[PDB]
Each structure stands twice: as C-alpha cells, then as structure tokens.
Design an enzyme around this catalytic site. Structure first.
Site, PDB file in Angstrom:
ATOM      1  N   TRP A   1     -17.890  40.715  69.243  1.00 62.78           N
ATOM      2  CA  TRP A   1     -16.991  39.608  68.388  1.00 62.78           C
ATOM      3  C   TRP A   1     -16.931  38.138  69.008  1.00 62.78           C
ATOM      4  CZ3 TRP A   1     -12.813  36.267  68.458  1.00 62.78           C
ATOM      5  CH2 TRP A   1     -12.333  35.343  67.164  1.00 62.78           C
TER       6      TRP A   1
ATOM      7  N   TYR B   1      -6.832  44.224  56.106  1.00 63.79           N
ATOM      8  CA  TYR B   1      -7.472  43.474  57.527  1.00 63.79           C
ATOM      9  C   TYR B   1      -6.554  42.588  57.648  1.00 63.79           C
ATOM     10  CZ  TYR B   1     -11.221  41.189  60.602  1.00 63.79           C
ATOM     11  OH  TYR B   1     -12.348  41.245  61.866  1.00 63.79           O
ATOM     12  N   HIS B   2      -6.198  42.327  59.696  1.00 62.35           N
ATOM     13  CA  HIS B   2      -5.112  41.823  60.170  1.00 62.35           C
ATOM     14  C   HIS B   2      -4.105  42.448  60.151  1.00 62.35           C
ATOM     15  CE1 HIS B   2      -7.742  38.412  61.669  1.00 62.35           C
ATOM     16  NE2 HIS B   2      -8.504  38.811  62.037  1.00 62.35           N
TER      17      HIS B   2
ATOM     18  N   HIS C   1      -6.383  45.510  64.289  1.00 59.30           N
ATOM     19  CA  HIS C   1      -7.595  46.004  63.547  1.00 59.30           C
ATOM     20  C   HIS C   1      -8.308  47.377  63.712  1.00 59.30           C
ATOM     21  CE1 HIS C   1      -7.880  41.425  64.997  1.00 59.30           C
ATOM     22  NE2 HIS C   1      -8.741  41.758  63.909  1.00 59.30           N
TER      23      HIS C   1
HETATM   24 CU   LIG Z   1      -9.880  39.772  63.041  1.00 56.15          CU
END
Ligand SMILES: [Cu+2]
Ligand SMILES: *[C@@H]1O[C@H](CO)[C@@H](O)[C@H](O)[C@H]1NC(C)=O
Length: 626
Positions: free
Chosen positions: A271, A470-471, A569
């Site tokens: 990432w 997400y998150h 995550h």
């Molecule tokens: Cu992220």
C-alpha cells in the site's frame, strides 16, 4: 445562551419568538432578528428527543429523524404523522415508515435485514416504527452509540492489572489521511466513561495503515503505514510511545504476528513504500533489530486483484505457532507456512477455497486444538461482491499440511467485517457490507452473527445501529462484551487540508458495545457472573499451574485465556483463545497452562471463569513470559 424545546431540540416581536417560528419550520437550521447535542446527519441508536406513541396496533414516533434506505413505497398524499401512521398500518409488513414534513409524503421502509435501514438526525422528517421485541437471551443486546473524538480506524486494549480498563484507538494526522509524522489518538476508559484525545509526534510516525503486534512485555509494536518505514512502540507502563528501529523494507496494509519466541514476523504491505510485493522480515525486541527475510517469499501469498500488486499482499491471516513458525490462513485461496530460519522459508499448507477473500474475518478460536475460523471477505480489495463462505482450518505440526472444512455459509455476504472470539470459543462476526466498497455505508449488514464451532452452525444476533464497513473495528472487552466502532475517513491530498468536500455520512467517529446472549438468563435479566476473587499479579510461564479463587458459581466452572486484542482493516493478529482444564478443590481453582508457546503466545491474556451454562466472569489480566 440556548432555549430547549418541550421535545428536546436546542437553538442558540422577540427572540424566543423567531426561535418558536424556526421550530415550526422543518426547513429552518438558522434564523436572523439550531444546535442539538448531535448535529443534523448524525446516526442514532435511540431517539435523541422525546418519543410519542400513536394507535388495534401501536407505533412509537421519534420527531426530527430519518430512516435512510430502500423504500417499499413513497406516497405524496399524507399531510400528518397520523396519516403516515395510518398508511403504515394498511401496508403489509411495514415495521418502519417516514413522514416528510417539507413535501407532505409518507415513505414505508423496505424489509429487514434484506434492506439496510439507518436512523439519522434530520429536522425535515420524523420516523414511525412498530415496537421491537428482542429476547436478549437469544439475540444479545447493543447499548447506545458512544461518541468519540477520533474515528477508531485502529484500536487496542491497554494491558493493566487487575483487569484492563482502557481502549486506545487512532486515525491519521486528522481524526477523520494523506508521511505527515503525526497520529491523532483517542483514549477511552470503559470503567468510568472517561474519553481523552492526544497527538503522538515524538515517533515522527503517522500510524495509519500499520502492522500491529503485542510483544512479550505487553508493549504494542506499531509498524509502517503512512510513514512506511517508521516503527513506534507503545509502553502501557510509560503510557508513552518510543521510536523502534526502522523496518528493513517500508510497508502499509501488512500484518505482523508475535511468534512463540516473542519476535514479530511481517510480510507484504505494498500500500505505501514502493508499489511492489514485500518479502518477510522479523523484529527481535531483545536485540531491538529488524532482519530482512528474502526467502519469506511474498509471491506464494499474493491474491489476484483487479487493482494489482498494490493490494494482493495486504492484510495476511498470520498466526504465530510452534517452534517460531507462521501460518498464513489467507486471504489467498492457498494457505502457507512461513518461517524466520535461514533467510526465511515458505511452503504450501493447503487450499482454503476456489477464490480469494481479501479482508475476510479470521480468528484462532481454539489454540490448544490448532483451530482457525475464516468467513467473508471478497475476491478483490474493492468493487467486488463479498462471499458467505466460511471454513475451519486445523493446523498440527508446522510445515506439514493443514486441514480445511467448509462450514455453513453466513446469512449475509460481508466485506470489511470484523470478528472476535468469545470465552465460550464462539466467534462473533460484526459489520461488513454485501459488496466491498471502500468509504461507503452501502448495504452494511447491521445484524451481527454468532458462529458456534461445536454445532458448526450460525445464529443471527440483535442488530447494531451504524454500518461498520471499511476502517471499522471489533475488539473483545474484559467484561466479555464486544466493542464495534469506526468507519470512514477521507482522502485529503496535502496534510492540513480542510475536510469540506468529503462525504461525512460515511464517517462514524463512535462505537457501540454488544452483550452476547450468555450475559442473560431466560427472562432477559443479567445472569450471575463468576468472580475471580484472588489471583497472583505475577508473570507465569508455559507449563506452570495458574491458581485463583472463584466465588459465585452453582457447580464446576470452566476457564479460558483470551490474548488481548489489536485491530485495524479486519486484521486482529494478537487475539487468540487458549482453553484451560480446571481441577476444583473447594472455591480454589487451578489449571496447568499448555507446555507450548506456539499455543500460549507470550503476552497479556484475559482469564475468564464461566458458569456451566456458559456465563463468563469479568476477566483478570494474566501475563505469560518466555
Ligand atoms: Cu485504509
Ligand atoms: C483438557 O483435558 C482433556 C482431557 O485430558 C484434553 O483432551 C484437552 O486437550 C486438555 N487440555 C486442554 C483443554 O488444554
């Protein structure tokens, strides 16, 4: 100076004159001549204002609130809450309806849980519902939204005695990312309700998108991320952060795992740093040194992702196991053994599935039996439909085959869900959405699911209130309840840029706590918890006999250790359940810890004594040493 309406609304010929005029008008936020606790748009678990009944079948009305989601019907007729109520009564299977004050229309919300319906604060509408009947004995129970200064995108329990009392959580340089060198942390004492925030700058580390492992001494090793090569070490003793040695290879969205020998292994994390697959590396806390492990080859663990190598080595299901081995349960369709011997090693362990399950949930629910449970995830990081598939993976000797049994499908496909293991060894899956869509509430599953490996069967729990996509995070609390929190965060180009064009609807700078069924008797009263009355605060070593005094149980109580949790995550590489055998003589219980540090990983654990009906104690903290 602030007037507060008879209902509960608060504003900041006269002045209470136009103020009164403003509370007539559904279209009025400002007035010249509105400031509620939670702002317009805010998600809710309960009516913030004074509720109201309305009638041979009754409805509860919450003013100044909306039900977002697919409607079954929208009708332009209705000019009164009364008439919208009347219309919900004549529409088969209407549990939720919405009155639009501004356009004089009645929406009937569509059916749940096939639809995802969210309770928002909006003065333009009012909500109408048929009273719910949740038996907490079957479905457990959620408390109300706990509001937080920072979105809990990553979170960990602070190891303390006699039992942990605090949950540290953190975001990027901002509380709602962009190499900054700052990280906004929130601090939540759930003994007291106390909530502080700080800004951690000494480490020169934005700890967003990092590896997290708990070390032998319970220090928390926070690795890479927005600052791809930087490493901070959290000391519960100090309540301070310290720089650790730079990693050898810079990473984000990687997983680290504490090993039997108390070193930490990590592999992948493309990432941030170079956009290329990342070979393994091992941190030694005694030498305080990172060592690059080239033969810890990343190639075997890649997923195939439409977005490419950026994603394919992310969020690995790593367990630290016997003789310093690493098991990689996924999310790649194939499972592998990794090691730190030589320049590091790799070999196929088994095939879990016919497709990848990026950010699926995974937990070692039973360490002594080598048992791992996987569910959900999706074949690509984003813009991919999630799977309902779940598996039990059994591991014996490192670097020999693993066994995978597919089990009952989950009731819902979940992308970006979270999982915790409970003291009974059941696995509670929370949040996630039907189609993995980063930074969305779209089709967030609210209904939590309890999977019971004893029956290999699922059970649908009470719904939470906010989508945890997400998150989002899930972590076990010492009272054996589950914290579910976070969701969102905005991409902001430079550092210090003001969030004005971001979608704040997807941000949930808050959390909510679930009591499982096991906290309740048949009548929905709270069941009677064992008390661990006396326990040595002393370190204990594998193979030793733990001795503690249990008062308040009818019969022979069982016990289990749950390693403390770190999470971000859909990766909690620190949680693991070690079931204990108990020999009872009086009210004094004693258990011989397993002989193997591959099962009993060095670190801080929750000790839980549970009734024979499966009601767990509050936990007493337990430190395992090497
Ligand atoms: Cu992220
Ligand atoms: C507990 O006892 C049973 C019978 O001896 C055994 O099979 C189990 O694996 C033992 N060890 C544990 C549960 O830690």
């Amino acid at each position: 100076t602030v007037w507060e309406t008879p209902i509960g609304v608060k504003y900041t010929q006269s002045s209470l004159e136009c103020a009164k005029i403003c509370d007539s008008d559904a279209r009025c936020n400002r007035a010249v001549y509105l400031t509620n606790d939670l702002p317009e748009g805010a998600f809710i678990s309960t009516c913030s204002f004074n509720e109201t009944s309305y009638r041979n079948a009754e409805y509860r009305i919450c003013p100044d609130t909306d039900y977002t989601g697919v409607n079954a019907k929208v009708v332009e007729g209705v000019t009164t809450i009364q008439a919208c109520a009347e219309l919900c009564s004549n529409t088969q299977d209407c549990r939720k309806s919405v009155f639009d004050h501004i356009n004089n229309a009645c929406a009937i919300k569509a059916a749940e849980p096939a639809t995802s319906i969210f309770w928002v604060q909006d003065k333009q509408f009012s909500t109408i519902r048929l009273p719910e009947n949740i038996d907490p004995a079957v479905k457990g129970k959620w408390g109300d939204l706990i509001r937080l200064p920072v979105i809990p995108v990553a979170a960990y329990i602070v190891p303390s005695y006699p039992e942990p009392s605090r949950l540290l959580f953190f975001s990027s340089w901002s509380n709602d990312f962009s190499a900054s060198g700052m990280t906004q942390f929130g601090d939540y004492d759930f003994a007291t309700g106390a909530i502080s925030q700080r800004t951690v700058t000494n480490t020169h580390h934005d700890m967003f998108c990092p590896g997290i492992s708990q070390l032998e001494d319970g220090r928390i090793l926070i690795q890479g991320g927005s600052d791809a090569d930087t490493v901070s070490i959290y000391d519960p003793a100090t309540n301070e952060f310290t720089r650790g040695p730079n990693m050898t290879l810079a990473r984000g969205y990687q997983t680290s795992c504490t090993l039997s020998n108390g070193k930490v292994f990590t592999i992948g994390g493309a990432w941030s740093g170079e956009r290329v697959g990342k070979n393994g590396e091992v941190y030694d806390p005694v030498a305080n040194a990172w060592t690059y492990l080239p033969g810890a080859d990343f190639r075997p663990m890649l997923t195939n992702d439409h977005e490419g190598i950026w994603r394919e080595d992310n969020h690995a299901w790593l367990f630290g196991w016997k003789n310093g081995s690493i098991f990689q349960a996924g999310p790649s369709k194939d499972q592998h053994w990794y090691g730190i011997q030589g320049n590091g090693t790799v070999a196929k362990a088994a095939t879990r599935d016919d497709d990848d399950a990026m950010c699926g949930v995974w937990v070692m629910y039973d360490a002594v039996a080598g048992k791992i449970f996987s569910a959900g995830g999706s074949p690509d990081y984003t813009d991919s439909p999630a799977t309902q598939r779940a598996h039990i993976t059994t591991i014996g000797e490192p670097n020999t085959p693993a066994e995978v049994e597919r089990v009952a499908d989950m009731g819902f496909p979940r992308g970006f869900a979270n999982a915790v293991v409970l003291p009974d060894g059941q696995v509670l899956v929370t949040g996630g959405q039907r189609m993995s869509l980063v930074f969305t509430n779209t089709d967030g599953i609210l209904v939590a699911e309890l999977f019971n490996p004893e029956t290999r069967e699922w059970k649908q729990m009470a719904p939470m209130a906010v989508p945890r996509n997400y998150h989002s995070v899930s972590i076990l609390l010492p009272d054996a309840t589950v914290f579910s929190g976070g969701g969102g965060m905005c991409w902001v180009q430079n550092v210090g840029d003001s969030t004005a064009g971001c979608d704040k609807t997807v941000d949930h700078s808050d959390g909510e706590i679930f009591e499982p069924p096991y906290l309740f008797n048949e009548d929905g009263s709270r069941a009677a918890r064992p008390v661990i009355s006396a326990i040595s605060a002393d370190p204990i070593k594998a193979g030793a006999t733990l001795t503690f005094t249990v008062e308040g149980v009818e019969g022979q109580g069982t016990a289990a250790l749950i390693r403390l949790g770190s999470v971000t995550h859909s990766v909690n590489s620190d949680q693991r359940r070690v079931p204990l055998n108990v020999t009872v003589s009086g009210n004094e219980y004693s258990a011989t810890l397993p002989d193997d540090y591959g099962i009993l990983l060095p670190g801080y654990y929750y000790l839980f004594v549970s009734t024979p009906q499966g009601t767990p104690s509050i936990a007493k903290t337990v430190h395992v040493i090497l």
